[PDB]
Amino acid sequence: PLDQPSCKALYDFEPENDGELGFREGDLITLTNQIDENWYEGMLHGQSGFFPLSYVQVLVPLPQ
Helix, strand or coil, X not given: CCCCCEEEECCCEXXXXXXXXXXXXXXXXXXXXXXXXXXXXXXXXXXXXXXXXXXXXXXXXXXX
């Protein structure tokens, strides 16, 4: 198994601007940073952006 930080989308998320990363329920998202208590940065299909913690479930956590 990979030790790359990652999470799985619980719900579809449509971005409100180009800073946000869109995704569909069930997508495996690469985690790259945690901005704050409520927001992550990550990657999907090579694209990068921010999205809410509340829309995802962590698989492999970022270092704390």
